Amino acid sequence: LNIKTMIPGVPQIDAESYILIDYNSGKVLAEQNADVRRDPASLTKMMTSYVIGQAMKAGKFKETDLVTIGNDAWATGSSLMFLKPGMQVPVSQLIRGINLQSGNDACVAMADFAAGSQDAFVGLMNSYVNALGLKNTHFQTVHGLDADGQYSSARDMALIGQALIRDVPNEYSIYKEKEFTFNGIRQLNRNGLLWDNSLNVDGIKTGHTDKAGYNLVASATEGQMRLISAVMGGRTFKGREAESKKLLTWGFRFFETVNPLKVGKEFASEPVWFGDSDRASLGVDKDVYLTIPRGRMKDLKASYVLNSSELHAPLQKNQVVGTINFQLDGKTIEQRPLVVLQEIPEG
């Protein structure tokens, strides 16, 4: 009974807010103050990078194209790290600026390159905020420096992390590079968790300011399963990576993600009346991913009901005709629309 139906206690997290979600199912495994609005500091860069990734996915420009450093990037010497006006730097180098402590000039140069001005780019950032359904996020700048007013939340930063991975995977593969060239200089990635040999961490963005505290969006995998954590307003230097490691590790220990049905696969067969054939093939039009307590796969039950006494032609491909019900311990934990996998026209 009890160890099986157990609800795991959540580790203490020495931070102001956090959330732990599964990349595939979207399930929230743990959260604290996940919708509280806070300054994300350099985490803002995740959205900048999302837009750039969309631009590249749309084929507007590529990693080899040369970019011109404007009086723009400069305006925001003794140092080799800074892009000087008039130099030409490949996109490949600039976008990897996301992995740096600064590299704020690179954000500006890329923003002008992709959308003409910093303010129009920000306009695109806020547009995507809206397209992703984010309720507690708004940006003022492309790098988050001088934006006393910029805000996001543990939940929204996690969701932006999820979007990068999902929508712009080529932009995302950049985050795990431990070392890369930036402005002719060999630089190390700021995400120390990439070097942790206990977990397989491959993203995403860490940041710290005195005002916003330590901030980190991370993502890790274990075989076929991927988790995303967001910990904001982390209080100590010592916990800057350890708090998230603990959270991710906990997630993998107590939860597992299953893929009970993929699109196109016949979940069930059903008789159809009045059609050019007499059997309908039923499934889903979106892959099914469920996150359940680890070790309960075998207890997962799947069934379905039909939205009407029985099926009549005509049926359209992907026509919703019922509901798939998944349960654990008699309880229904997830429902999904049952769809017709192939059209059955009237006889």
Cα–Cα distance between 54 and 93 in angstroms, integer?
17
State the CATH class of domain 1-254: alpha beta
Residue type, 199: L
The catalytic residue among 17, 25, 45, 152 is 45
As its CATH architecture, domain 255-346 has Sandwich (2.60)
Contact between 267 and 338 under an 8 Å Cβ cutoff? The reply is yes
Entry resolution (Å):
2.0
Token code pair at residue 302: 């799947």
Contact between 84 and 74 under an 8 Å Cβ cutoff? The reply is yes
The position carrying tokens 């130099």 is 87
- Cα dist. 309→155, 270, 322 in Å? 41, 12, 11
Sequence-distant (≥ 6) Cβ neighbours of residue 343 within 8 angstroms: 314, 315, 316, 317
Phi-psi region of 216 (alpha: psi -120 to 50; beta: other; left: phi over 0): beta
In DSSP terms, which residues pair with 155 in a beta bridge? none
Q: In whole angstroms, how large is the CA radius of gyration of the chain? A: 24
Cα–Cα distance between 279 and 337 in angstroms, integer?
19
Q: How far is CA 85 from the centre of its chain?
A: 34
The catalytic residue among 92, 102, 176, 246 is 102
- Residue 137: half-sphere exposure toward Cβ, Cα within 13 Å: 30
Domain coordinates of the chain in residue numbers?
A: 1-254, 255-346
The catalytic residue among 17, 25, 27, 42 is 42
Cα–Cα distance between 280 and 259 in angstroms, integer?
23
Sequence-distant (≥ 6) Cβ neighbours of residue 72 within 8 angstroms: 108, 109, 112, 118
Listed residue (199, 190, 193, 166) closest to 22, CA to CA: 166
Active site residue 45: yes
Active site residue 229: no
Active site residue 246: no
205 is in an annotated binding site: yes
Contact between 229 and 18 under an 8 Å Cβ cutoff? The reply is yes
| DSSP element (H, E) containing 26 | none
